[PDB]
Amino acid sequence: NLWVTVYYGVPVWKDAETTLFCASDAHNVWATHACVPTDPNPQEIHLENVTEEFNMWKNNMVEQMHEDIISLWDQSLKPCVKLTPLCVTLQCTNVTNNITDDMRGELKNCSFNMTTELRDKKQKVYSLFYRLDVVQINKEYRLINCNTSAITQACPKVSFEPIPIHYCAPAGFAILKCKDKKFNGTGPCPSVSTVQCTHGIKPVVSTQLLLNGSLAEEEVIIRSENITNNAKNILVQLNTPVQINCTRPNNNTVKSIRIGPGQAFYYTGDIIGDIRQAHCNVSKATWNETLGKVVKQLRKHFGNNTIIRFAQSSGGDLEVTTHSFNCGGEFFYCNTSGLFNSTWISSNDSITLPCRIKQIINMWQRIGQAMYAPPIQGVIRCVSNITGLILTRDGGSTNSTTETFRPGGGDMRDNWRSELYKYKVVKIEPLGVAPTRCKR
Amino acid sequence: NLWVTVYYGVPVWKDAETTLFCASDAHNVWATHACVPTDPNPQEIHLENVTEEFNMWKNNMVEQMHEDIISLWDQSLKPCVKLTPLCVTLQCTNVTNNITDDMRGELKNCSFNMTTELRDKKQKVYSLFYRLDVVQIKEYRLINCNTSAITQACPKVSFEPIPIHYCAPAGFAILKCKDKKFNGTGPCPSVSTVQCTHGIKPVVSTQLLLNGSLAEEEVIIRSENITNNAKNILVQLNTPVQINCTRPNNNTVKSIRIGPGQAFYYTGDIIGDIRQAHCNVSKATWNETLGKVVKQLRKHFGNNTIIRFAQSSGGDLEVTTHSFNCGGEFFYCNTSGLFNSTWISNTSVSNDSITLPCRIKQIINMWQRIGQAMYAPPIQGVIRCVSNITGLILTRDGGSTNSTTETFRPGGGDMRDNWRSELYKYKVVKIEPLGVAPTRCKR
Amino acid sequence: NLWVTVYYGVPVWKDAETTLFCASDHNVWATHACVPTDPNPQEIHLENVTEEFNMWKNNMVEQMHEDIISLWDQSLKPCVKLTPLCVTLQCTNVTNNITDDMRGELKNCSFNMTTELRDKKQKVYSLFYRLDVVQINKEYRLINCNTSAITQACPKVSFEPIPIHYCAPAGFAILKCKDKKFNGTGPCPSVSTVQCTHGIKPVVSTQLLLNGSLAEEEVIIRSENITNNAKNILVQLNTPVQINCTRPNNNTVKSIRIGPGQAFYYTGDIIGDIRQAHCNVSKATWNETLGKVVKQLRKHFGNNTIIRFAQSSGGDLEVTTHSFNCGGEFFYCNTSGLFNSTWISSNDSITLPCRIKQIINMWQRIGQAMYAPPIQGVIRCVSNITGLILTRDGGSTNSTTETFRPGGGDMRDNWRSELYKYKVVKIEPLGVAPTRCKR
Amino acid sequence: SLGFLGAAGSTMGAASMTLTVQARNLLSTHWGIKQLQARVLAVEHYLRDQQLLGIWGCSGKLICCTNVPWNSSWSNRNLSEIWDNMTWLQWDKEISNYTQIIYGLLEESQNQQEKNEQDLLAL
Amino acid sequence: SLGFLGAAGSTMGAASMTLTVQARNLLSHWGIKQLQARVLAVEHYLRDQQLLGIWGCSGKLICCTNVPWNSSWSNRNLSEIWDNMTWLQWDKEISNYTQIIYGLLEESQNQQEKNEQDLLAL
Amino acid sequence: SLGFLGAAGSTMGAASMTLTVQARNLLSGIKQLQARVLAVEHYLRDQQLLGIWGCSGKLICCTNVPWNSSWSNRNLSEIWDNMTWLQWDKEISNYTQIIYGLLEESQNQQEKNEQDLLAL
Numbered sequence A: 001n002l003w004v005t006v007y008y009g010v011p012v013w014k015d016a017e018t019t020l021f022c023a024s025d026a027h028n029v030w031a032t033h034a035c036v037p038t039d040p041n042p043q044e045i046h047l048e049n050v051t052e053e054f055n056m057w058k059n060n061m062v063e064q065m066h067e068d069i070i071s072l073w074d075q076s077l078k079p080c081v082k083l084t085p086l087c088v089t090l091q092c093t094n095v096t097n098n099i100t101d102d103m104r105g106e107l108k109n110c111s112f113n114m115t116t117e118l119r120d121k122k123q124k125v126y127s128l129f130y131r132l133d134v135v136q137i138n139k140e141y142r143l144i145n146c147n148t149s150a151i152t153q154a155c156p157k158v159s160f161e162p163i164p165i166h167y168c169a170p171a172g173f174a175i176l177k178c179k180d181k182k183f184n185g186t187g188p189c190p191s192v193s194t195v196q197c198t199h200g201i202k203p204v205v206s207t208q209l210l211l212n213g214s215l216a217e218e219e220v221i222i223r224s225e226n227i228t229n230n231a232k233n234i235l236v237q238l239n240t241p242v243q244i245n246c247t248r249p250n251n252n253t254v255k256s257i258r259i260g261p262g263q264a265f266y267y268t269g270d271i272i273g274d275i276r277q278a279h280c281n282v283s284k285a286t287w288n289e290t291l292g293k294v295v296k297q298l299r300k301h302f303g304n305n306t307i308i309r310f311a312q313s314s315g316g317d318l319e320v321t322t323h324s325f326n327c328g329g330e331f332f333y334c335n336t337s338g339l340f341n342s343t344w345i346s347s348n349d350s351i352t353l354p355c356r357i358k359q360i361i362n363m364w365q366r367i368g369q370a371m372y373a374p375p376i377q378g379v380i381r382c383v384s385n386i387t388g389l390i391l392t393r394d395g396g397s398t399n400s401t402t403e404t405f406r407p408g409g410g411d412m413r414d415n416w417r418s419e420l421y422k423y424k425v426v427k428i429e430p431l432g433v434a435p436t437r438c439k440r
Numbered sequence B: 001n002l003w004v005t006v007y008y009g010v011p012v013w014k015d016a017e018t019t020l021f022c023a024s025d026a027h028n029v030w031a032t033h034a035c036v037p038t039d040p041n042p043q044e045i046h047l048e049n050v051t052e053e054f055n056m057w058k059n060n061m062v063e064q065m066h067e068d069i070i071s072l073w074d075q076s077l078k079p080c081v082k083l084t085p086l087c088v089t090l091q092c093t094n095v096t097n098n099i100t101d102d103m104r105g106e107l108k109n110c111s112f113n114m115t116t117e118l119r120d121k122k123q124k125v126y127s128l129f130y131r132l133d134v135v136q137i138k139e140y141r142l143i144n145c146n147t148s149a150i151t152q153a154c155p156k157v158s159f160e161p162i163p164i165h166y167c168a169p170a171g172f173a174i175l176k177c178k179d180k181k182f183n184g185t186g187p188c189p190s191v192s193t194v195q196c197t198h199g200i201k202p203v204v205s206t207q208l209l210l211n212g213s214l215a216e217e218e219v220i221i222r223s224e225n226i227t228n229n230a231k232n233i234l235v236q237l238n239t240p241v242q243i244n245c246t247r248p249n250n251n252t253v254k255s256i257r258i259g260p261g262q263a264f265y266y267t268g269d270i271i272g273d274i275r276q277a278h279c280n281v282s283k284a285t286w287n288e289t290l291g292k293v294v295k296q297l298r299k300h301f302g303n304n305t306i307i308r309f310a311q312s313s314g315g316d317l318e319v320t321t322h323s324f325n326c327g328g329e330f331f332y333c334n335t336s337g338l339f340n341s342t343w344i345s346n347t348s349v350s351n352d353s354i355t356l357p358c359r360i361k362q363i364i365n366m367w368q369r370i371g372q373a374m375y376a377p378p379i380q381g382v383i384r385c386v387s388n389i390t391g392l393i394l395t396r397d398g399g400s401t402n403s404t405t406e407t408f409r410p411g412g413g414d415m416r417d418n419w420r421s422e423l424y425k426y427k428v429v430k431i432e433p434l435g436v437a438p439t440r441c442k443r
Numbered sequence C: 001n002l003w004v005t006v007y008y009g010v011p012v013w014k015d016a017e018t019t020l021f022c023a024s025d026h027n028v029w030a031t032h033a034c035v036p037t038d039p040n041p042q043e044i045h046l047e048n049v050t051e052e053f054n055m056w057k058n059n060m061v062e063q064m065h066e067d068i069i070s071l072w073d074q075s076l077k078p079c080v081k082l083t084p085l086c087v088t089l090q091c092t093n094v095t096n097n098i099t100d101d102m103r104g105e106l107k108n109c110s111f112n113m114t115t116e117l118r119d120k121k122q123k124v125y126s127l128f129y130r131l132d133v134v135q136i137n138k139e140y141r142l143i144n145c146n147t148s149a150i151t152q153a154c155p156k157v158s159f160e161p162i163p164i165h166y167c168a169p170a171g172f173a174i175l176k177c178k179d180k181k182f183n184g185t186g187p188c189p190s191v192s193t194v195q196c197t198h199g200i201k202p203v204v205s206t207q208l209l210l211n212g213s214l215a216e217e218e219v220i221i222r223s224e225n226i227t228n229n230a231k232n233i234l235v236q237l238n239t240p241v242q243i244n245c246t247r248p249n250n251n252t253v254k255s256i257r258i259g260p261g262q263a264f265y266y267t268g269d270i271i272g273d274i275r276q277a278h279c280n281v282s283k284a285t286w287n288e289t290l291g292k293v294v295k296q297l298r299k300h301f302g303n304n305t306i307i308r309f310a311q312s313s314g315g316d317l318e319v320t321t322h323s324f325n326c327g328g329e330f331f332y333c334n335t336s337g338l339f340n341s342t343w344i345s346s347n348d349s350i351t352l353p354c355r356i357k358q359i360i361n362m363w364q365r366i367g368q369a370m371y372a373p374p375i376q377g378v379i380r381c382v383s384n385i386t387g388l389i390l391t392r393d394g395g396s397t398n399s400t401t402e403t404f405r406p407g408g409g410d411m412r413d414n415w416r417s418e419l420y421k422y423k424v425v426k427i428e429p430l431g432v433a434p435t436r437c438k439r
Numbered sequence D: 001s002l003g004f005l006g007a008a009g010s011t012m013g014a015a016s017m018t019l020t021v022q023a024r025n026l027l028s029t030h031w032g033i034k035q036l037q038a039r040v041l042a043v044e045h046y047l048r049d050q051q052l053l054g055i056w057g058c059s060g061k062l063i064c065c066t067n068v069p070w071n072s073s074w075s076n077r078n079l080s081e082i083w084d085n086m087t088w089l090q091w092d093k094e095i096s097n098y099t100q101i102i103y104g105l106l107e108e109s110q111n112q113q114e115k116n117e118q119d120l121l122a123l
Numbered sequence E: 001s002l003g004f005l006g007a008a009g010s011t012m013g014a015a016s017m018t019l020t021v022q023a024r025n026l027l028s029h030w031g032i033k034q035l036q037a038r039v040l041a042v043e044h045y046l047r048d049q050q051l052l053g054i055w056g057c058s059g060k061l062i063c064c065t066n067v068p069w070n071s072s073w074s075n076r077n078l079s080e081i082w083d084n085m086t087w088l089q090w091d092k093e094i095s096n097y098t099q100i101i102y103g104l105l106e107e108s109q110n111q112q113e114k115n116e117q118d119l120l121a122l
Numbered sequence F: 001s002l003g004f005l006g007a008a009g010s011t012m013g014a015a016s017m018t019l020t021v022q023a024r025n026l027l028s029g030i031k032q033l034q035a036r037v038l039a040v041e042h043y044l045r046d047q048q049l050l051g052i053w054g055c056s057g058k059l060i061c062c063t064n065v066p067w068n069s070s071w072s073n074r075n076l077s078e079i080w081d082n083m084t085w086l087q088w089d090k091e092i093s094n095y096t097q098i099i100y101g102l103l104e105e106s107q108n109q110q111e112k113n114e115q116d117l118l119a120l
């Protein structure tokens, strides 16, 4: 005695994979002018009796963020100088004017025959290089990219400083956000809300230590696809930030050479003052409190009678074993063995991390597309917040009481996924039926 | 008593900015083959009892035309030869062979070592260049060698303007102002609706506007703010003034291969004597034309002022000289002979004429951009073109608070001002068909 | 009496030209860019529908042509340019292992080529086929240096055809002609509706049609106009003829870095005797096949006439020989062994000599040339001849003899051999008719 | 059962009973653009037909009777001939000429009807 | 016979007879330029149709509802609305109260649908 | 008020009163363009389907198809007001391609009958 009644505008949905678009607040490498201007007053709708299941490791928003960043990165280099004329034999000697023995062998004084704006003329050039960019070819050296990639100069007018971007769902779709404090990313979320756009996310690029992200609501959160499987990385979200102060303690004079009709090359000409090693400062007390919190949360998964030991990375590319980041436009590779060297068993004194600098950069783990980072004029300093760690675990210890964690990393999707863990995209399915007593 | 009634198909609109697309009358730099073929008999709807406000100085259609022209221009050079092997030291001497008195130092005979089909070989090339394209470093270089790569325009692609019609997308309409003696920036009591504009030829010029529309009755003076001497004044004439331009030297064009399927074109030699390029206007027509212009300027600068015309002055050649494309060649004509007079309320106005000397360049930097350049291949033979002057761009000297004499000079250099002279009568509006009103009808 | 009644969803259509898109099951056909197909496509038989087809005026062919060319060019965009190779070559004859058939076919060329560092050069030598190298006045240059630039095809991207399915947009449908013995034009009494075509392999060849569809019962002779000497004849066979092609020489392939991130591939040497490339066609199969063709030609040209087959009259290598891509290598085979017979009312074979080229122009364009990297080892491929392209000589009009020669070279004619049974129509669902029904 | 164009060739009467089959099939690198152009085109065609049904007063109906009388000048066939001995393809060709005349009349009738409804409701 | 917007400037009571004239024309480098323009025309068309749907006017050019007119939106005699004003003038006067009238219209239709459902159930 | 999906999680009886809330938020470089096209296509598929079923102008539409207990054997009092739409949608997802087929068949029969009655 019941009849089918059709209802349209029914508040239901399904998991879905769709295209998201970029929005930004009203140069850079994020085409932020190409992104849709944002809503000054975004809405968020709390769903009072909705429990939803989230899985951050299957979140396709991460894959899109990854592809958008790489694409935008490459687009920003399209119009820049192609420094193919630099792949020549370089004649290099050591910079010995000011040695502290930290920098011995870190800078070389190279000279070469560079092209000029006229096809029939050459010029002799003298420039300084940071060692890691230069390899011997037998005093005769070549740049490291000569046997794999054409090198493109980044445009000096375009900044690499992250600008928050927002991902927005298209009409017919919505983004559900998990508001459950202390949510580990995989499972039911008792408290959710609907938004159309994500919070602004800064595409900060780093390894090991994740800078300038979101903090845990109350306590350190240990997130992993599988804790038992040591092949997975562990993303640790910190409750409080750890301040890190990084510097390039040298006054560099930058020169510019015309190398073709509409092209010029930027390089370090000389150094004013003494020559010193780049470094980062982390307070010992803050860092010691930070690890104590991490250790406590790891014991909840590994045992209260389990010893937690930290150790330095076992090896790999410099891009993996060090803390890579970009400050002032310069690319730093800092050694974190000073942060992860202790065993944990149930005031103005800092930790100094020495750093290396590179000008030839190979991002996103690709081969064949090298970038040359122009030197930045003057003396460089930045201050940033460590808001999370990436740790890996040593396996095979089936009969031990001590677990070892190391500062691994290098896969950029892990950083993206550390902000896009509370969001999922759903398709709205407004049409449906139910029995009623109403008959046409 | 009354109820809301909803109506759909209501004839109302709002000002709006949307994307317009082109249409054309079914090779060239405008890629007109890529435009939508036009309706051979489009319909214009007259709107009785509609007064609308138009503002030519705040009209996006101008900005879109500007962007489309630049984009198309650049696209036309994408498949063309990049003359980077050409940026070399040149060994140049003066051409003194059969030169007249004005053509002294104008042409240089340059010898250089050019690349060829094989990388192992070089060839010696002798070509003639104009003095404006070459700078001293006998050693000279091309002017573009310290700012840009230069692209040779493809000889098969025409630069002759083809009328382009702008068309609104469905849901939008273009209103046209039919008022005569309409200066823009006002109410227009007589309007009509069209879907597409008339064809507009994208003619590029500086001081004098060539081949545009004429005023129907009187010369019209238009400006954003007439009392602000920083603004340009556009003048639309009601009769054309005919101008005859020529490049009298008979050129022999030669070409060489400079690479694997690439070739460079250059002037090899000149067959007859070497003479200066020039343009003629008749004196009587030009003298009557100015009288008509002065008469209208007096509506804004009245009470018997002295209206003085003077030559343009500044360092930039595009700004001070009349720049135009004549048969594919690029001319820079000196207009001081046209703008050198004083008019008073007590003065007024056979086969005599005014000759304007012209300079020619092959390295062209358009749209005021830096970093791009085009090399215009030479044209074999002798060039002649006849054009109509349909308007002027003028500026006014400031600093006068204590004088009864106003001075006007030719202006130019901002291409959007040329576009504005054709698009001044059009406005784009969005159609808003849905609305409500009270009636006595209740559901 | 009667009123107009409006019906929507009426099964009626009108001929249309619309854009079709591809679908499919690295590779130059960029099949990852196509929509994955339906594993079980539908086909609806239309009882009592007679429709008119015309394969000679079919926009589907024009679109396939444009897509094939565009895919081809796209696949070369990221590949190494070989402009550093337009240098003077110092070439001598290869003689050490040459059989008589190969005298003069290979040249041993030395040259100065660039290195990663722009201030150094390296001396390189390689073997080239005679057809790729032109004498300058021992001084030679590559054949393309005065007309085009060379792009090396990427060594890891396959040329092997992958079936492409063309699919209509919603609102459109593709009608298929099911008639057996359908000659490409006129009414087709048995039709069906599909949304996507069968997969078509974009096989590129010039005289014989390889790996296509066979006729259901009989050889079919198709032409826009039989008596027009300006038109080609497409012959569809009802049986395949197997053809076995080889490049018997064992090539050793070497590579050189020519710039940062760039390398050139070339034949370094040949190990073993040097012999010509060739294709084998069985005598008996070919004679039966050709006999079937003349029977159908007589229906068009007279019951008691003479049909003569002859070799191509002349022109570019691409039209005088049968060209194909075998193993990724480019072959130019002489078919005079197949078309040298006058027809009047065990395990033997025909060997077709073949030449090979590495510098390939394609789609009859100028300015875009490709270098085909050599393939290491020995090449063998086996394929089926499913059709022929023939051209008829104008006759004297007063003599009962016709002469047919291999024709071809216009790629659209190869496409037409698969896209002859398909037509694209627009569905027009809205219409009216009278009935006794008033609002 | 049949299929998308499966009723084609059947007579008009029989074919009128399969209208939802076709109704369901409507709407269901530069090669990304090619797909968008195909999608947009399908949408625009769908909407133009829907716009006419709206204007003529049919809207969301497959079979819509109206108030425009049939002219013997468009067709002078008997109903049994039209519905039982003809297919829709044959019919469409026969009255192709008169399509725009009929469409104009359908539109005028609906405009008159909407105004009349408004006046009667006001009373 | 007037063309598109030919009735603009005529009074509201005259213009209302040309509603199909302005209805027929709705929905009726360059690759993208043109494609975006086509998509946009469709989106605007559909938004208007969606509102008519929600308000219960989906099949009509002229639709009468059950929402009373407020003198606070506009206090005018019908004779000075329909005979002495054009639609452009009307729009300029009622523009500030439209998002009030449109909101009521949606609420009224939603209540009406619920009432119909209950009556049919009886 | 509540918001765009504010009634999600509410029982069906309450959620059915906010249908305009969700309806108004449907349909509201080339990545964005592709997304815009999809929004239109999804909107139209649902409208097309309502049209076929004879529900083209309605948010709530009552048809002539009876409910089968094999789809869901429940009291109305435990469907309405004791269940949410998300829960309901999952419970009968198996049967929606059956129900939709029946709705289409019902409308075709109804239109033919209307035509015959007008003819008489």
Ligand SMILES: *[C@@H]1O[C@H](CO)[C@@H](O[C@@H]2O[C@H](CO)[C@@H](O[C@@H]3O[C@H](CO[C@H]4O[C@H](CO)[C@@H](O)[C@H](O)[C@@H]4O)[C@@H](O)[C@H](O[C@H]4O[C@H](CO)[C@@H](O)[C@H](O)[C@@H]4O)[C@@H]3O)[C@H](O)[C@H]2NC(C)=O)[C@H](O)[C@H]1NC(C)=O
Residues within 6 Å of the ligand: B158, B159, B160, B161, B203, B204, B210, B211, B324, B325, B326, B327, B328, B384, B385, B386, B387, B388
């Ligand atoms: C303002 O408006 C005027 C009028 O439209 C423009 O003047 C015209 O400019 C065009 C372009 O330069 C001229 O067209 C060219 O004419 C040459 C001479 O042809 C004469 O002789 C033939 C017979 O042999 C007659 O049919 C013809 O009518 C002429 O009497 C041709 O040789 C040119 O063709 C060559 O160049 C083109 C590329 O430009 C190639 O495509 C051709 O294959 C060929 O190689 C060309 O047709 C036209 O004659 C001019 N008209 C007048 C009256 O002078 C002004 O230029 C314009 N002003 C501005 C600033 O834009």
Ligand SMILES: *[C@@H]1O[C@H](CO)[C@@H](O[C@@H]2O[C@H](CO)[C@@H](O)[C@H](O)[C@H]2NC(C)=O)[C@H](O)[C@H]1NC(C)=O
Residues within 6 Å of the ligand: A184, A185, A186, A187, A188, A222, A223, A224, A225, A226, A227
């Ligand atoms: C994150 O929290 C969820 C609980 O919400 C954990 O999921 C449980 O995992 C165990 C072991 O695989 C299963 O037996 C339970 O059934 C799961 N519960 C639920 C509700 O799904 C998950 O393991 C935690 N992950 C991390 C890294 O802490």
Ligand SMILES: *[C@@H]1O[C@H](CO)[C@@H](O[C@@H]2O[C@H](CO)[C@@H](O)[C@H](O)[C@H]2NC(C)=O)[C@H](O)[C@H]1NC(C)=O
Residues within 6 Å of the ligand: A226, A228, A229
């Ligand atoms: C999480 O990781 C553990 C550790 O590898 C997985 O458990 C193992 O499963 C394999 C079979 O694939 C067995 O042979 C091992 O003996 C198991 N190891 C332990 C310690 O139990 C577990 O399956 C993973 N979880 C998921 C969901 O994949």
Ligand SMILES: *[C@@H]1O[C@H](CO)[C@@H](O[C@@H]2O[C@H](CO)[C@@H](O)[C@H](O)[C@H]2NC(C)=O)[C@H](O)[C@H]1NC(C)=O
Residues within 6 Å of the ligand: B048, B049, E009, E010
């Ligand atoms: C513009 O409005 C004027 C109103 O004065 C119209 O002039 C009147 O038009 C009506 C017909 O619509 C005549 O009956 C009157 O005699 C005319 N004059 C007066 C004094 O009203 C004029 O026709 C309108 N223009 C249009 C829309 O064509």
Ligand SMILES: *[C@@H]1O[C@H](CO)[C@@H](O[C@@H]2O[C@H](CO)[C@@H](O)[C@H](O)[C@H]2NC(C)=O)[C@H](O)[C@H]1NC(C)=O
Residues within 6 Å of the ligand: B183, B184, B185, B186, B187, B221, B222, B223, B226
């Ligand atoms: C073009 O015509 C309009 C309309 O007559 C002129 O607009 C007037 O400008 C003055 C000075 O700014 C204002 O005080 C008036 O109120 C404007 N009138 C109207 C109706 O808006 C405009 O100045 C003219 N332009 C030129 C260069 O003469």
Ligand SMILES: *[C@@H]1O[C@H](CO)[C@@H](O[C@@H]2O[C@H](CO)[C@@H](O)[C@H](O)[C@H]2NC(C)=O)[C@H](O)[C@H]1NC(C)=O
Residues within 6 Å of the ligand: C183, C184, C185, C186, C187, C221, C222, C223, C224, C225, C226
């Ligand atoms: C394919 O078959 C059709 C017939 O089915 C041939 O068409 C006829 O050609 C003759 C000669 O021009 C005309 O007089 C007839 O009127 C045509 N009939 C029809 C139905 O079109 C066609 O010529 C044949 N083509 C080939 C290559 O065999």
Ligand SMILES: *[C@@H]1O[C@H](CO)[C@@H](O[C@@H]2O[C@H](CO)[C@@H](O)[C@H](O)[C@H]2NC(C)=O)[C@H](O)[C@H]1NC(C)=O
Residues within 6 Å of the ligand: C225, C227, C228
């Ligand atoms: C098919 O080809 C024949 C040629 O065999 C065409 O007939 C010729 O037409 C021209 C005019 O264009 C006449 O001058 C010739 O005298 C005709 N030749 C013969 C032998 O009669 C025929 O027109 C072509 N068919 C079509 C449809 O174009």
Ligand SMILES: *[C@@H]1O[C@H](CO)[C@@H](O[C@@H]2O[C@H](CO)[C@@H](O)[C@H](O)[C@H]2NC(C)=O)[C@H](O)[C@H]1NC(C)=O
Residues within 6 Å of the ligand: C047, C048, D006, D007, D008, D009, D010, D011
């Ligand atoms: C194709 O045409 C045939 C012949 O008219 C149709 O078959 C007839 O169908 C009617 C109705 O069921 C029967 O009464 C006749 O006896 C059938 N005739 C024969 C010879 O069997 C057939 O239905 C048509 N096909 C379609 C799809 O409409």
Ligand SMILES: *[C@@H]1O[C@H](CO)[C@@H](O[C@@H]2O[C@H](CO)[C@@H](O)[C@H](O)[C@H]2NC(C)=O)[C@H](O)[C@H]1NC(C)=O
Residues within 6 Å of the ligand: A048, A049, F006, F007, F009, F010, F011
């Ligand atoms: C979420 O669920 C709770 C019940 O768990 C709802 O609370 C009830 O709301 C009704 C409203 O008519 C009241 O009569 C009951 O007394 C409330 N229950 C209790 C225990 O207080 C709540 O309204 C739901 N929220 C939403 C948005 O639907």
Ligand SMILES: *[C@@H]1O[C@H](CO)[C@@H](O)[C@H](O)[C@H]1NC(C)=O
Residues within 6 Å of the ligand: A094, A096, A104, A105
């Ligand atoms: C230059 O640096 C290398 C280490 O990279 C060191 O072995 C060598 O002795 C140094 N030369 C001088 C002169 O200091």
Ligand SMILES: *[C@@H]1O[C@H](CO)[C@@H](O)[C@H](O)[C@H]1NC(C)=O
Residues within 6 Å of the ligand: B093, B094, B104, B105
């Ligand atoms: C070339 O002509 C210019 C202009 O008259 C003159 O200044 C210059 O000295 C001349 N140069 C030579 C080499 O004659």
Ligand SMILES: *[C@@H]1O[C@H](CO)[C@@H](O)[C@H](O)[C@H]1NC(C)=O
Residues within 6 Å of the ligand: B346
């Ligand atoms: C203009 O002419 C009149 C009449 O001849 C004369 O009176 C007046 O002074 C003249 N004005 C000037 C400025 O010469």
Ligand SMILES: *[C@@H]1O[C@H](CO)[C@@H](O)[C@H](O)[C@H]1NC(C)=O
Residues within 6 Å of the ligand: C093, C103, C104, C105, C130
């Ligand atoms: C090389 O081959 C050519 C044929 O291509 C022949 O004419 C020439 O004599 C041969 N030269 C030598 C040295 O064998």
Ligand SMILES: *[C@@H]1O[C@H](CO)[C@@H](O)[C@H](O)[C@H]1NC(C)=O
Residues within 6 Å of the ligand: E096
């Ligand atoms: C309409 O709203 C605007 C903006 O709030 C206000 O300035 C104006 O006075 C209002 N009323 C009218 C009749 O315009």
